[PDB]
Amino acid sequence: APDRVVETYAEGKPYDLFFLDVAGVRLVGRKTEAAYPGPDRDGLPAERLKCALVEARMLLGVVERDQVAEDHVAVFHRPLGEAEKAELFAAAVADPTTDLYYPYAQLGDRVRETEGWEVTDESARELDHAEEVLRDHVPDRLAELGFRGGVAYDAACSTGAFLQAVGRRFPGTRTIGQDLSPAMVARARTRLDEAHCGDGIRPAIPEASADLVVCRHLNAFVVGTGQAHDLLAAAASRCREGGLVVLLGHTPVLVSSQWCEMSGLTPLQRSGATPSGHALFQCYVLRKG
Amino acid sequence: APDRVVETYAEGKPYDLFFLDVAGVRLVGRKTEAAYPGPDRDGLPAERLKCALVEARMLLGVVERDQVAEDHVAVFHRPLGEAEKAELFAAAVADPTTDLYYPYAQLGDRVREWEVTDESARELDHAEEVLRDHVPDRLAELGFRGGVAYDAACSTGAFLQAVGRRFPGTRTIGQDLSPAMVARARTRLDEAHCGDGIRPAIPEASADLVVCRHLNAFVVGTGQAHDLLAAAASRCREGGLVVLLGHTPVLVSSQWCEMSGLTPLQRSGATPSGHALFQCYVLRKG
Ligand SMILES: N[C@@H](C(=O)N[C@H]1CN([C@@H](C(=O)O)c2ccc(O)cc2)C1=O)c1ccc(O)cc1
Ligand SMILES: N[C@@H](C(=O)N[C@H]1CN([C@@H](C(=O)O)c2ccc(O)cc2)C1=O)c1ccc(O)cc1
Ligand SMILES: Nc1ncnc2c1ncn2[C@@H]1O[C@H](CSCC[C@H](N)C(=O)O)[C@@H](O)[C@H]1O
Ligand SMILES: Nc1ncnc2c1ncn2[C@@H]1O[C@H](CS)[C@@H](O)[C@H]1O
């Protein structure tokens, strides 16, 4: 017996249906608010945050097909037992090449409300807070994948917090940020070696001059799909051959790992796990060929 | 390295992206005009017609994932050579449980836009010739013994008449929304009743075969197709057969039929040559 999960375009959230590429099948689930940043301790329930994190309890089933209608999207799956949910998730957590993706990220009415970002200090602290798990995982993981400093470039550095954490992990690395918003640059001048204002489609640094390129904005509610591709190409062109390009998102990343492959960017990592194994999140680490 | 097939919503045809499920392995293609009704011959090129038929040459690759964006739909896939296309297409022809479906059929602008003449009725019948010539035979092979046959959107009556030809003694009862269609169908069926299939013209669980050739792109919407399937399949006896086909893509999934208590015995049918496949959901009612 198959089952169906549905998200409508008007009131629903198609971008909350996620696929996990595990054991040569696709598992579908529906993101809800996760235990953040880590799992619940005894007598101390973790904050619940809608964010990059998905958990095993959010899984639903093994995908057979989808159906994309005039007013909703449906995924037909074989529902998973609660035990296999845990096992398949553990297997994903054990293998950072596991893809995690959101194929309807740009589908529906809510994402059309996208309109750079001039925010208050508190709003900026909230942006930073939802990327804490990312700032704690990626730097160490870049080291495990062989990064040894150099020049690091964030093509949409917002507050500068993320690239600042890369710099701290790798002493002597020059941190170069760029952001469309002048207000953001003002904030990042306090944390980066360089902070440039301008649309990332016109990169502020020369071609093949960066050892690491970071893009945390090619996401739903930030840019559109074709925009995300053009911005990836501009950012990746700043990476030298053999360098690393990293794509992350608080909201779903709009570029597929397949498109990355097509662009000559080899995925060395597609997802990351919290240290407890309780949650997974998109983490595309790509080698520039 | 993967490749990507795109259909845009404004000018593209997302309904022409088709998928084959050859035993868990998913293939994607783009439908073009097909050799109709059968393969090219020695000195005769076949007619080429945009219809229910797909061929191996229209396949593209092994599905990796899709991406349904704000202005287009994309499928990423591992490209296939023509020989492996034909090899995989052969295995599909050899297993009629293979699913053939069009998951973006109702996506985009073109699809968001029947009291016809005998010239139009004749063109309607022509694009369905390959279905009339081979589904009834297939139904015999699957054990259909006759009885009462009901077409919930009988149009001209040509299709349900082909059923009656194949199983003499079967009582043929058609319903159609269009009064003009009923007038044609009355000259081909035992009965022809005018009215929306949502109010079926025969009693519940009184038919041994129920036919729907209208739950499809450019005919009804998605919600309508599910409502009309429910009405039509209530007319089918337990152990009877529900058959869904379409010149244009069928909007109901075989998974939705299983959730509705209808077991797929077959999901696609092939031309006698094995040159082409068409959607052919034959469901046993539970
Ligand atoms: N302007 C901000 C904005 O539109 N938030 C929306 C998207 N969302 C949640 C929802 O709809 O359930 C959500 C959150 C995370 C997730 O993974 C999925 C859904 C909002 O709330 C914004 C802030 C930071 C950012 O990186 C991008 C956008
Ligand atoms: N009013 C007729 C109509 O709108 N035809 C449209 C759909 N189409 C072709 C196209 O768009 O390339 C096409 C044809 C078959 C196919 O499998 C895929 C695409 C048209 O032309 C009509 C006639 C019979 C019927 O059962 C339903 C609709
Ligand atoms: N075309 C573009 N070029 C450079 N920066 C851009 C851009 N489009 C959006 N941005 C920047 O991307 C940032 C949002 S990325 C989403 C926020 C992220 N989670 C965070 O923690 O900061 C904003 O600062 C915005 O100014
Ligand atoms: N709700 C409905 N009930 C019965 N017939 C219907 C219908 N909607 C469309 N049709 C009928 O199906 C045919 C096109 S394939 C045509 O003869 C039309 O009158």
Q: How far apart are CA B49 and CA A36, in angstroms?
A: 57
Q: Could you tell me which of A279, A141, A278, A273 has the C-alpha nearest to residue A214? A: A141
Please name the residue whose Cα sits nearest to atom 13 of ligand 3: A158
Domain boundary among A49, A78, A112: A112
Q: With an 8 Å Cβ cutoff, are A65 and B21 in contact?
A: yes
Paired tokens of A216: 């945390």
Q: Say how many Å lie between the CA of residue A249 and the centre of ligand 1.
A: 10
Using CB atoms, pick whichever of B4, B68, B70 lies closest to residue A73: B68
Number of continuous H segments (helices) and E segments (strands) in chain B: 7, 15
3-class SS shares of chain B: helix, strand, coil, % to 5: 30, 35, 40
Number of Cβ within a 10 Å radius of residue A233? 12
Q: How far apart are CA A169 and CA B208, in angstroms?
A: 72
Q: Say how many Å lie between the CA of residue B167 and the centre of ligand 4.
A: 24
Q: Could you tell me which of B11, B19, B30, B16 has the C-alpha nearest to residue B72? A: B11
Q: Say how many Å lie between the CA of residue A262 and the centre of ligand 1.
A: 28
A132 and A221 in a common domain? yes
Q: Could you tell me which of B37, B41, B75 has the C-alpha nearest to residue B59? A: B75
Q: How far apart are CA A261 and CA B208, in angstroms?
A: 53
Q: What is the DSSP string of chain A?
A: --EEEEEESSSS-GGGEEEEEETTEEEEEE--PEEESSPPBTTBPPEEE-SS-B-GGGEEEEEEEEEE-SSEEEEEEEEPPHHHHHHHHHHHHH-TT-EEE-TTTT-STTGGG-------HHHHHHHHHHTHHHHHHHHHHHHHTT---SEEEETT-TTSHHHHHHHHHSTTPEEEEEES-HHHHHHHTTTSSEEEES-TTS-SS-TT-EEEEEE--SBTTTS-HHHHHHHHHHHHTTEEEEEEEEE--SSPB-S-HHHHHHTTEEEEEEEEE-TTSS-EEEEEEEEE-
Using CB atoms, pick whichever of B3, B26, B253 lies closest to residue A67: B253
Q: With an 8 Å Cβ cutoff, are A67 and B103 in contact?
A: yes
A126 and A262 in a common domain? yes
B123 and B95 in a common domain? no
Find the ligand nearest to A182 CA: 3
Q: Say how many Å lie between the CA of residue B250 and the centre of ligand 3.
A: 42
Domain boundary among B112, B131, B151: B112
Q: What angle do CA A145, A147, A149 make, to 5 degrees?
A: 165
A122 and A89 in a common domain? no
A112: closest chain B residue by CA = B70
A104 and A126 in a common domain? no
The residue type at B189: L
A174 and A65 in a common domain? no
> Which residues form the domain of B81?
3-112
CB pairs under 8 A between A and B: 91
Give the method used: X-ray
Domain boundary among A112, A141, A159: A112
Ligand 1 in contact with A76 (CB < 6 A)?
no
- Chain B residues in contact with A64 by the CB 8 A cut-off are 21, 255
B125 and B40 in a common domain? no
Q: How far apart are CA B15 and CA A148, in angstroms?
A: 49
A198 and A184 in a common domain? yes
Find the ligand nearest to A124 CA: 3
B234 and B124 in a common domain? yes
A135 and A74 in a common domain? no
> In B, what residues contact A, Cβ < 8 A?
1-4, 14, 19, 21, 26, 64-73, 76, 99, 101, 103-104, 106-107, 112, 221-222, 253, 255-256, 258-259
Q: Say how many Å lie between the CA of residue A93 and the centre of ligand 3.
A: 28
Which residues 6+ apart lie within 8 Å of B194 measured at CB?
A: B175, B176, B177, B178, B179, B182
Ligand 1 in contact with A250 (CB < 6 A)?
yes
- Chain B residues in contact with A70 by the CB 8 A cut-off are 106-107, 112, 221-222
Q: With an 8 Å Cβ cutoff, are A70 and B107 in contact?
A: yes
Query: Which of B22, B70, B102, B229 has the highest number of chain A CBs within 10 A, making it the mutation to test binding with A?
Result: B70
Query: Which of B27, B65, B72, B101 has the highest number of chain A CBs within 10 A, making it the mutation to test binding with A?
Result: B65
Q: Tell me if B53 sits within 8 A of B130, measured CB to CB.
A: yes
Q: How far apart are CA B175 and CA B173, in angstroms?
A: 7
Q: What angle do CA A163, A169, A173 make, to 5 degrees?
A: 65
Please name the residue whose Cα sits nearest to atom 9 of ligand 1: A50
Q: With an 8 Å Cβ cutoff, are A262 and B3 in contact?
A: yes
A127 and A90 in a common domain? no
> Which residues form the pocket of ligand 2, taking CB atoms under 6 Å from any ligand atom?
B 13, 50-52, 124, 216, 218-219, 247-248
**Atom number, ligand 1, closest to the C-alpha of residue A16:** 18
Q: With an 8 Å Cβ cutoff, are A68 and B103 in contact?
A: yes
Max CA distance (Å), chain A:
58
Instruction: Name the phi and psi angles at A81, rounded to 5.
Output: -65, 155
| CATH code of B265's domain | 3.40.50.150
B92 and B131 in a common domain? no
Sign of CA dihedral A215, A105, A66, B278: negative
Find the ligand nearest to A130 CA: 3
Distance from CA of A21 to the nearest CA of B (A): 9
* Count of structural domains, chain B: 2
Ligand 1 in contact with A51 (CB < 6 A)?
yes
